Every structure is written in structure tokens, then in C-alpha cells.
């Protein structure tokens, strides 16, 4: 590290890259976030707009795991098949892939993107978006609610 640092660039130059007029002082604005509102307000406004004051209720003891949900969009569901499985379904319209999204850790199925139309697929999941259910039904697939 020490080979390449700023001291090696400035070593004989007296004011050290920190200004002959200025003369580098211990804490020339005071500590940390102190100048907010008071004299660094312009910095806070232009770079940190939401910062000051309160919003909303207090939950007091939230717990993350109650609301924990990983989501997946329908577009990427056929991608959860390996290559040979995807070829096999593409060939054969007699059978649908069943997809248990839980093994892949997902719990809500969302509606984004296109599908290769006229091919059934069974989606098993806890939760589905309104659009996702409609598109899965539209393409001839099935939605299965399961805990």
C-alpha cells in the first residue's frame, strides 16, 4: 500500500496539497452530521431530500419473518425447468409441467412479461397476482393455491 499513497506524491511540498492559505485544521466544521439545517442545509436539501422530520405510525416490535415473501414473475417460471424438460414440454402438448415454486423458495407469483402462447402449465404457489392468475388461465394453465 505505502508505495503508492498521496504522501509519496506530495512529500517535499509544504502545505501538503491542503492549501497554503487554508492551513488544514482539526475539525473545521465540527463533527459528523452537525451542520444540517444550521449551515450545511443546502448540501442536505440537494443530495438527501427525505431526511428531516417524522412520518407514519410506530410498530414497536415488527419481526421480519412474519412478512417474509420471495416473489417470482410468470415469465421466468418456464426457466425454472432444465433444458431437456423444457424441450420435452415444447414437443408434447399432452402433459403440462407442474411447478412447485416452494422448492425454489418463492411464495407469490407475479404477472410480468410474455409467454409462448397455447401451452398449459400448472403453477402451485401460496399467492398469485391478479394478472398472473389471468395469464396462466389464458395460456391454458392452472393455478393451485397451496400453503
Amino acid at each position: 500500500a505505502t508505495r503508492f499513497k498521496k504522501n509519496r506524491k506530495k512529500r517535499g511540498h509544504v502545505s501538503a496539497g491542503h492549501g497554503r492559505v487554508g492551513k488544514h485544521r482539526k475539525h473545521p466544521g465540527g463533527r459528523g452530521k452537525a451542520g444540517g439545517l444550521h449551515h450545511m442545509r443546502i448540501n442536505f436539501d440537494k443530495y438527501h431530500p427525505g431526511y428531516f422530520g417524522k412520518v407514519g405510525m410506530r410498530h414497536l416490535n415488527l419481526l421480519k419473518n412474519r412478512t417474509y415473501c420471495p416473489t417470482i414473475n410468470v415469465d421466468k417460471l418456464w426457466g425454472l425447468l432444465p433444458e431437456e424438460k423444457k424441450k420435452e414440454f415444447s414437443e408434447n402438448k399432452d402433459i403440462a409441467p407442474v411447478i412447485d415454486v416452494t422448492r425454489k423458495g418463492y411464495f407469490k407469483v407475479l404477472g410480468n412479461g410474455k409467454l409462448k402462447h397455447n401451452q398449459p402449465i400448472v403453477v402451485k404457489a401460496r399467492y398469485f397476482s391478479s394478472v398472473a392468475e389471468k395469464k396462466i388461465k389464458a395460456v391454458g394453465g392452472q393455478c393451485i393455491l397451496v400453503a
Binding site: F107, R126, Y127, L145, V146, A147
Partner: protein, 95 residues
């Protein structure tokens, strides 16, 4: 809320009775002591005051008694319970 005890869970993930599929697999002696202790000890001054209020036997006296008990005893369930116990004792005493 309200997890089932009698109708099996239906595989529905909304947190009702439901959830994932499953089948659940599920005097005399103290009373004699109490009577003896009361014969030895009688009643506390607040108990006596409550007895007088309950004996008066009005909506006003009974409200007063409950407030007095709640103020002294603190715990509301306990105060109601003590008032109930004393009321029963006054009923028993009359016989």
C-alpha cells in the same frame, strides 16, 4: 387467529383455521383449612368495610365498594373476585 381444534386444516395460506395439511394427535382439604384459618383470624378491616357496604346493598353502595376495592387492591379481576367472595360470605352468613 383461531387455529382449528376440530376440523382439519385445508391447505390455505391466509392464517385462518387453515394452514398446511395435518392431523393433530391430541374439593375438601383446603376448604377445611380455610374455615379453620378464618375462625382463628376473622376479617381484615377493608373486608369489614366491604361487608358493611355490601350489607347496605344499593347500586350506589355496590359501585362505591367496587371503586374502594379497586383503589386498594389495584388488580381489577382480583378486586371483583374479593368483592364476590365477601358477598357470598354475607349470603352464607345470613343462613
Amino acid at each position: 387467529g383461531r387455529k382449528s381444534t376440530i376440523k382439519p386444516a385445508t391447505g390455505i395460506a391466509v392464517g385462518f383455521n387453515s394452514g398446511h395439511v395435518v392431523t393433530k394427535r391430541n374439593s375438601k382439604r383446603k376448604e377445611l383449612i380455610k374455615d379453620v384459618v378464618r375462625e382463628i383470624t376473622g376479617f381484615s378491616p377493608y373486608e369489614k368495610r366491604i361487608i358493611e357496604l355490601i350489607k347496605i346493598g344499593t347500586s350506589a353502595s355496590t359501585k362505591r365498594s367496587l371503586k374502594y376495592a379497586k383503589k386498594k387492591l389495584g388488580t381489577h379481576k382480583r378486586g371483583k373476585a374479593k368483592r364476590e367472595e365477601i358477598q357470598k360470605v354475607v349470603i352464607l352468613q345470613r343462613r
